[PDB]
Write a protein that binds this ligand. Structure first.
Ligand SMILES: CCCCCCCCCCCCCCCCCC(=O)OC[C@H](COP(=O)(O)OCCN)OC(=O)CCCCCCCCCCCCCCCCC
Ligand SMILES: CCCCCCCCCCCCCCCCCC(=O)OC[C@H](COP(=O)(O)OCCN)OC(=O)CCCCCCCCCCCCCCCCC
Ligand SMILES: CCCCCCCCCCCCCCCCCC(=O)OC[C@H](COP(=O)(O)OCCN)OC(=O)CCCCCCCCCCCCCCCCC
Ligand SMILES: CCCCCCCCCCCCCCCCCC(=O)OC[C@H](COP(=O)(O)OCCN)OC(=O)CCCCCCCCCCCCCCCCC
Ligand SMILES: CCCCCCCCCCCCCCCCCC(=O)OC[C@H](COP(=O)(O)OCCN)OC(=O)CCCCCCCCCCCCCCCCC
Ligand SMILES: CCCCCCCCCCCCCCCCCCCC
Ligand SMILES: CCCCCCCCCCCCCCCCCCCC
Ligand SMILES: CCCCCCCCCCCCCCCCCCCC
Lengths: 102, 300, 160, 311, 480, 100
């Protein structure tokens, strides 16, 4: 169809012109003007929590777009999924893993 | 028997002792070579810091005690000062304050000015205080001269000291609220400070350091119509103060940031010599205006 | 459709060979992110929209962020000053066996029937429908696998 | 040929949307100054031009002709790379928003998924700015800020999943067409507040705000204009996802979209001017213990209500 | 397909173990108690073991496009659950001396047992992948549970990296097989190939990559080099679990894969597996000669016994008694490894810190611990194929299976490897009774001693009378 | 229009390049990077195979693959952090004490 290829062209021009304008104003900023510790493991902990819960989030992303055709059995499976996810979250909170201060 | 007897007002490489009578008071010759030398000292101090001469122990012995420098540049009204923090994650294991970055030699200047011309130097001891800073010096000189000021002098000096106290408290509350994170109360409190400054400009002729108290009285008389400005200020204040409380001082985010942080009892306040609101927050009712009254504060 | 597929595949291969030979960890992770973007473009060229969505959202958006967090946590010595993976006496053996494996797999691939990928978009709705249909226990025990990884990584990665 | 005419018209509409949103972000920064002045009982910048409208051009000229300074012992590529990430990620996050019927850049079948990819890629700006500055203070600050935005990004898509479930599709045209009778703010109010909090936090806005003390000239301008582009992006997203999008009874649809977007930007200004800043660990506790279970329970209740009506 | 409540009865041990994981996790989150969490974990494992009876009463059925449940699956589910229960029983006295958190161990054991159950009931490449990963990742946590110790962290890093590589190999092989076939079901691999077109190059290369992954998972040569280091460095209950449950479940899903798929009729894969089994037997017996550390010796023993199991596997398409022999050998090997590693775990407990040596020094064990030495020498005789032991009956079954399909090279390999095993097993058994100058007090240590005692008596009784085991293995029959 | 053989060739190439990255690098971080390259390449292979047949099975196995990749990243980076904490280096032949 003409509409889909036209919008693909429009999206391509959008990306190209955005990148070109941004790097162009970088070029204008550079071109003008005259010249003259050890971290803690808590950052890794919260980042790995974020990664695991983003994979849980991707599963819920796949579920949420097709609730109507999956029916009530999909609701039951996602309820078990979400209950396991919340049990893991309560486990992380209760043992002081998610508490930033010691 | 002192644990770490090092210099606190002058840098460690400073020959002589300034408050001795055989030491010259005026400024010595300036040299950019010494400026470059002290710049080099600052540059290798940030890279080759040795947490031993400051009295600290455990110089990153736990392999995670990171070292931070807060100052010396400080984007706030307190002024320039340094704290060297030893940190375990976010916990402050130990800190050594480094002061002396605002030493003007006011006592040595006290040995160099007369009793009359030293009053402006008494103003700039605490620049949020002004006449409150002028008051104890002129009272002590009146004790030395055997002067008993009349009642009108006492009421005038109480008026100006209370006005500058309101000014300082407004600045303090606004700066604390800005340190928590709210922005509008500093603008509003500085508008109120401008009202105070209008009245103080009418009375003395200056905003921050009036230099208006004298040995035995004040410089001039009250101008014809000061009561109108005082009435305008007293009508302007309390609604705005209640608005400040409601807008920022009752916010639960500010309460979570401020309640229970750096708490100490009465024993810690007494053993460290903390006075003022820090002593009266411990329940020790010790105000100088009520315990050892001065300048007609009994009449109020 | 094919044009984007070929360019994105070339970009992914180039970024991978830049990853495996580089010395700076942050530059290596950046080139790996570029490779994941290229592989997402490969997914979008073939019609697998949800696969590309999870390629940038999760692999490029969570896992690489975790690697980046670990790299900046370590303040990454003993690697850059010798660079022994570029002298041929170390890498020529694995490269030769690597090429042998590649020719074997390519020879196996080239002898199969091929009707060509039509590029018909299998959207996220069909993936979600089949994911909670014939793939129930896969979802549940994958959640338990992520739970196990969470518990293991928490237990190992403390400081005491 | 009419096909080429339609292609050129669509390209013209897309580039018009692009320049309009970039100019809107820059003038929204100017409106930040003016509206902060209005909220704080003053005027703000109102001397450079008629009403101050030419302050923006003078500021951009100053940042253009400022001497650029890449640090000597830094990593040049990463240091310059963080600002194009901070700009382009939120710009292409705006790229999916349909501002009017027919005035849409791309009717992507993923949509809010594509916003999730761009929001995931946005954290590399903060991480790269912290590492490439060769400053341990900026490194620690960016580690804290990146942990903040990860802990608040972890529930962004889960907050949006209620709108996705009610629409039944990932396309934004279907989302703004499913709000014909009732807007999504009424059923998805908890999703609305969680998405608003997450969108404020991933834009590093007050009260979720150093790793910018090493940038100057046009790189700082890139960071700040990209941040305001993200503000406009999040406002337009919440207009299209919770407040009916372009749909309105009386006025033309673009006027409704602009009015709702401007309302949400002035809500951004008021949120910055009003609330103070919570502590780091309190923000962590609020982002983990409260918001994520709230989004999960909201998704479960949304699915139960959706399956309940379709007996 | 959809899921019926009868299918949920067929899902009983999986759901019970998952709910036990949830309950143990919430009990850990409530308050950290070692005894309560261990009791909850063993109660849930026993509940799954006794719910296997209800699963068998329900019947055999295909619960999912993924899963199929039959008596074959119940047999391996019971073996995995018994191995997990023994691992918890041996792990409690080891965990009394652990200064850090003792409670995550039972959660990881439970999740690994869950993966073993999924691999037992697997009838799909997705279920195979997920069961392998659900076995491997808790073992990544368990091998380096004492991460402050040097050897445990060593073995954890080695096992994690190598098993991630094997996971990538297996998943690429499944990708190639799915690309060739078109369906991921076990029975639909090469179904469209007919009349001599079974040997398809893409399918064969994909299955070869799966062979690489599963041969890492089964310690088969040349993917065997990880076995002694990971076995030695890991804690002794972890070595027990990794020797028994992981090997049993992965070999069971390999049995189901090579039985159901028409790919197993290919002679090329049969020749490749014959070479792998021959080299595995010969190597795993030969490198255990000069071993003085018992853990590395048991690792090479595991390599040799999985070679014997592969020899029993090869005659699946030709013979008919291959799976029955595999089940008998797996039961006997499970009991023998459980007893040997249990004796090692009991005499290497409590965990006396990471800075102290964990060397065993089994010489002179009889002169202060007579019952443990008796159990250990009984099970060293059991692993050698010496009669009046169940390992002898298993080796007899393997030899009969090899003779039936005329796999004579494998038979000679079994004989030679059995002789080498006789040498080193008998050296250890005699060294238990020599003289050494250098040489508990709770009911859990007594429980572990009771467990290894019943294991030794079971081995002896089923060695002098193997008919009930043969009958209950023939009762467990999958769906041809 | 796009052949299936081209997709599997690209996936195989990325997989074997990840194998080089795993083998030739002593740094454990680059070993984990090569592991992630291989598992992501095999996930690409599954997506190509599923897109040829027009089924979502490739995308489902892709989802399982990236779940494994995320959890393996978590475990491997935790082990790397422990190794750097207790040895102050990331040399993989430094952890070679058990042998024979
Ligand atoms: C495009 C449009 C978007 C524009 C923006 C609109 C949405 C803005 C959302 C802003 C979100 C800010 C979130 C701040 C969370 C702070 C949580 C926290 O922990 O705060 C600390 C404080 C005290 O914590 P506690 O542990 O109790 O302290 C005891 C120790 N002293 O804890 C507390 O004080 C507890 C209460 C915390 C805050 C509750 C939620 C407030 C949300 C902001 C107000 C929204 C108002 C409506 C906005 C317009 C809607 C159309
Ligand atoms: C950067 C350079 C490489 C990526 C861009 C290559 C050029 C793409 C130009 C547009 C194009 O080829 O579109 C075709 C197709 C659109 O989809 P379809 O509906 O199948 O259209 C085919 C006919 N109707 O397009 C597709 O199906 C896929 C379009 C490209 C994939 C998304 C963008 C990937 C960008 C990766 C950047 C890595 C750095
Ligand atoms: C950098 C240079 C990029 C040049 C342009 C690349 C192509 C852009 C358009 C594109 O990606 O189109 C493919 C696809 C179209 O999606 P849709 O219209 O829903 O599908 C058509 C019917 N199947 O759209 C997508 O797949 C959109 C998702 C990928 C967008 C990538 C953006 C950069 C990262
Ligand atoms: C180190 C010790 C162990 C040594 C290695 C293990 C034993 C190796 C045995 C090699 C046997 C080679 C057989 C070669 C021909 C095979 C194909 C064939 O035609 O077989 C014939 C026959 C099967 O055909 P069928 O239809 O049954 O014919 C009727 C036979 N009555 O076949 C049959 O019916 C069965 C044939 C069985 C042959 C005897 C096998 C055992 C012999 C005793 C042990 C080996 C010799 C002694 C040890 C060697 C020195 C150490
Ligand atoms: C007539 C021909 C046809 C009939 C053939 C019949 C074959 C079966 C019967 C014969 C078996 C021969 C076995 C020879 C070795 C006997 C065991 C032995 O001597 O053990 C002692 C020896 C250690 O003693 P020492 O010399 O002190 O070594 C110092 C090391 N610490 O220990 C060692 O050195 C290590 C022992 C390792 C295990 C034993 C060796 C196994 C070798 C393969 C066995 C099968 C042979 C098959 C037929 C081959 C050809 C005859
Ligand atoms: C210090 C120990 C280093 C061990 C390196 C091992 C490299 C093995 C390469 C094998 C190549 C085989 C090619 C055929
Ligand atoms: C084959 C099944 C097991 C049979 C019994 C094996 C031995 C078990 C332990 C029983 C007691 C053994 C006593 C040995 C005494 C040796 C004394 C030597 C004196 C020089
Ligand atoms: C080292 C192991 C040696 C094993 C020898 C086995 C010999 C088997 C010979 C079989 C011949 C079959 C002929 C058809």
């Amino acid at each position: 169809s003409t509409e889909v290829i036209a919008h693909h062209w429009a999206f391509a021009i959008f990306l190209i012109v955005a990148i070109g304008l941004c790097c162009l104003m970088l070029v204008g900023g550079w071109f003008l003007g005259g010249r003259a510790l050890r971290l803690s493991a808590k950052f890794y902990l919260v980042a790995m929590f974020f990664v695991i819960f983003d994979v849980e989030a991707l599963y819920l992303f796949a579920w949420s777009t097709s609730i109507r055709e999956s029916g009530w059995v999909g609701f039951v499976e996602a309820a078990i999924f979400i209950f396991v996810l919340l049990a893991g979250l309560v486990y992380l909170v209760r043992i002081g893993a998610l508490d930033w201060t010691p | 028997g002192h644990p770490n007897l090092r210099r606190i007002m002058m840098p460690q490489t400073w020959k002589g002792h300034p408050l001795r009578k055989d030491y010259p008071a005026r400024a010595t010759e300036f040299s950019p070579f010494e400026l470059t030398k002290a710049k080099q000292d600052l540059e290798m101090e940030a890279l080759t810091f040795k947490p031993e001469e400051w009295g600290m122990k455990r110089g990153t012995e736990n392999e995670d005690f990171m070292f931070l420098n807060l100052g010396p540049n400080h984007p706030s009204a307190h002024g320039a000062f340094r704290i060297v923090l030893q940190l375990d994650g976010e916990e402050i294991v130990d800190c050594v304050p480094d002061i002396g970055y605002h030493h003007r030699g006011a006592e040595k200047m006290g040995e160099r000015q007369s009793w009359h011309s030293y009053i402006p130097y008494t103003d700039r001891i605490e620049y949020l205080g002004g006449c409150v800073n002028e008051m104890p010096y002129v009272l002590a000189v009146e004790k030395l001269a055997g002067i008993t000021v009349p009642d009108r002098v006492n009421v005038i000096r109480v008026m100006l000291s209370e006005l500058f106290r309101i000014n300082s408290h407004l600045l303090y509350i606004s700066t604390f609220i800005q340190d928590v994170g709210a922005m509008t109360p500093v603008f509003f409190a500085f508008t109120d400070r401008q009202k105070i400054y209008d009245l103080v400009e009418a009375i003395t002729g200056f905003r921050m350091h009036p230099a208006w108290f004298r040995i035995g009285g004040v410089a001039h008389d009250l101008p014809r119509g000061w009561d109108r400005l005082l009435r305008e200020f007293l009508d302007w204040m309390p609604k705005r103060l209640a608005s400040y409380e409601k807008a920022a001082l009752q916010n639960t985010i500010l309460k979570g940031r401020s309640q229970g942080v750096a708490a100490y009892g009465a024993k810690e306040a007494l053993e460290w010599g903390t006075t003022g609101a820090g002593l009266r927050a411990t329940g020790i009712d010790f105000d100088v205006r009520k315990a050892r009254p001065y300048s007609g504060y009994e009449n109020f | 459709m094919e044009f984007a597929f070929y360019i994105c595949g070339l970009i992914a291969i180039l970024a991978t060979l830049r990853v495996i030979t580089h010395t700076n960890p942050v530059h290596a992770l950046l080139y790996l992110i570029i490779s994941l973007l290229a592989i997402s473009g490969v997914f979008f060229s073939l019609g697998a929209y949800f696969a590309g969505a999870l390629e940038i959202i999760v692999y490029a958006g969570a896992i690489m962020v975790l690697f980046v967090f670990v790299v900046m946590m370590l303040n990454l010595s003993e690697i850059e000053q010798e660079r022994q993976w570029l002298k041929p006496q170390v890498w020529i053996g694995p490269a030769i066996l690597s090429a042998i494996m590649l020719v074997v797999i390519v020879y196996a691939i080239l002898g199969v029937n091929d009707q060509g990928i039509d590029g018909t978009p299998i959207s996220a709705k069909a993936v979600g429908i089949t994911l909670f249909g014939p793939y129930v226990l896969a979802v549940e025990l994958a959640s338990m696998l992520l739970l196990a990884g969470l518990v293991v990584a928490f237990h190992v990665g403390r400081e005491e | 040929s009419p096909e080429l005419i339609e292609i050129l018209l669509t390209i013209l509409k897309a580039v018009v949307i692009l320049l309009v949103v970039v100019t809107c972000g820059a003038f929204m920064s100017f409106g930040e100054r003016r509206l902060l002045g209005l909220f704080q009982n003053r005027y703000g910048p109102n001397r450079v031009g008629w009403g101050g409208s030419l302050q923006l051009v003078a500021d951009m000229i100053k940042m253009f002709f400022k001497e650029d300074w890449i640090p000597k012992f830094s990593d040049r590529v990463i240091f310059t790379l963080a600002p194009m990430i901070a700009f382009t990620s939120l710009l292409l996050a705006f790229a999916i928003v349909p501002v009017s019927p027919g005035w849409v850049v791309a009717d992507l079948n993923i949509g809010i998924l594509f916003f999730l990819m761009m929001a995931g890629l946005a954290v590399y700006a903060v991480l790269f700015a912290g590492w490439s500055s060769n400053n341990k203070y900026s490194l620690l600050g960016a580690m804290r800020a990146s942990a903040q935005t990860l802990s608040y990004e972890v529930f962004l898509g889960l907050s949006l999943m209620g709108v996705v479930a009610q629409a039944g599709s990932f396309n934004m045209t279907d989302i703004v067409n499913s709000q014909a009778h009732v807007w999504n703010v009424i059923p998805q109010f908890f999703g609305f507040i969680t998405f608003a909090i997450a969108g404020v936090a991933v834009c590093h806005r007050h009260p979720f705000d150093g790793y910018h003390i090493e940038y100057s000239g046009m790189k700082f301008g890139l960071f700040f204009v990209g941040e305001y582009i993200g503000i406009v992006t999040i406002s337009a997203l919440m207009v299209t996802l919770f407040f009916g999008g372009w749909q309105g009874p009386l006025l033309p649809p673009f006027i409704w979209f602009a009015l709702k977007t401007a309302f949400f930007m002035m809500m951004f200004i008021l949120i910055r001017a009003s609330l103070p800043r919570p502590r780091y660990d309190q923000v962590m506790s609020f982002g983990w213990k409260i918001c994520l279970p709230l989004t999960l329970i909201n998704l479960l209740v949304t699915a139960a209500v959706i399956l309940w009506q379709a007996q | 397909m959809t899921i019926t409540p009868q299918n949920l009865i067929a899902l009983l041990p999986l759901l019970i173990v998952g709910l036990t994981v949830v309950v143990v996790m919430l009990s850990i989150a409530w308050r950290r108690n070692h005894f309560l969490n261990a009791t909850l974990s063993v109660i849930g494992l026993n509940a799954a073991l006794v719910s296997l009876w209800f699963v068998g009463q329900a019947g055999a059925m295909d619960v999912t496009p993924l899963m199929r449940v039959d008596g074959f699956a119940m047999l391996y589910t019971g073996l995995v659950l018994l191995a997990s229960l023994a691992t918890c029983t041996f792990a409690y006295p080891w965990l009394e001396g652990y200064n850090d958190n003792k409670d995550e161990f039972y959660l990881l054991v439970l999740i690994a047992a869950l993966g073993g159950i999924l691999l037992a009931n697997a009838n799909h490449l997705a279920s195979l992948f997920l069961g392998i990963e659900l076995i491997s990742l808790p073992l990544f946590g368990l091998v380096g549970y004492a991460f402050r110790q040097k050897r445990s962290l060593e073995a954890s890093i080695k096992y994690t990296i190598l098993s991630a590589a094997a996971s990538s190999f297996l998943l690429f092989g499944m990708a190639l097989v799915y690309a060739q076939s078109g369906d991921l079901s076990f029975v639909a691999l090469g179904k469209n190939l007919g009349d001599g077109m079974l040997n398809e190059p893409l399918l064969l290369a994909g299955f070869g990559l799966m062979i690489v992954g599963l041969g890492f998972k089964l310690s088969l040569v040349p993917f065997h080099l990880w076995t002694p280091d990971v076995y030695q460095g890991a804690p002794a209950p972890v070595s027990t679990f990794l020797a028994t449950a992981s090997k049993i479940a992965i070999f069971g899903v390999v049995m189901r894969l090579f039985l159901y798929a028409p790919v197993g009729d290919s002679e090329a894969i049969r020749v490749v597996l014959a070479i792998i089994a021959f080299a595995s037997i010969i190597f795993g017996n030969l490198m255990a000669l000069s071993q003085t550390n018992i853990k590395r010796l048991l690792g090479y023993s595991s390599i040799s016994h999985l070679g014997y199991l592969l020899v029993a596997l090869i005659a699946l398409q030709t013979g008919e008694m291959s799976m029955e022999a595999v089940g008998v050998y797996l039961a006997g090997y499970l009991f023998s490894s459980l007893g040997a590693f249990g004796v090692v775990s009991l005499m290497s407990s409590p965990y006396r810190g990471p800075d102290a040596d964990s060397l065993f020094s089994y010489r002179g064990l009889f002169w202060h611990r007579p019952i443990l030495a008796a159990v250990m020498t009984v099970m060293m005789l059991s692993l050698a194929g010496i009669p009046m032991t169940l390992g002898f009956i298993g080796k007899f079954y393997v030899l009969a299976v090899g003779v039936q399909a005329h796999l004579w090279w494998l038979v000679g390999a079994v004989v030679v490897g059995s002789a080498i095993g006789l040498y080193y097993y008998l050296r250890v058994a005699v060294s238990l009774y020599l003289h050494a100058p250098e040489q508990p007090s709770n009911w859990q240590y007594s429980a572990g001693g009771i467990v290894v005692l019943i294991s030794a008596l079971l081995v002896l009784v089923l060695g002098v009378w193997p008919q009930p085991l043969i009958s209950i293995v023939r009762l467990a029959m999958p769906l041809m | 229009m796009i052949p299936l053989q081209h997709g599997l060739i690209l996936a195989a190439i990325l997989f074997v390049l990840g194998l080089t990255g795993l083998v030739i690098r002593r740094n454990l971080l680059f070993m984990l990077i090569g592991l992630e390259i291989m598992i992501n390449a095999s996930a690409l292979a599954f997506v190509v195979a599923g897109s040829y047949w027009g089924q979502t099975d490739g995308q489902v196995m892709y989802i399982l693959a990236i779940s494994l990749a995320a959890a393996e990243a978590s475990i491997g980076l935790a082990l790397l952090l422990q190794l750097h904490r207790r040895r102050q280096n990331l040399n993989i032949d430094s952890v070679s004490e058990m042998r024979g």
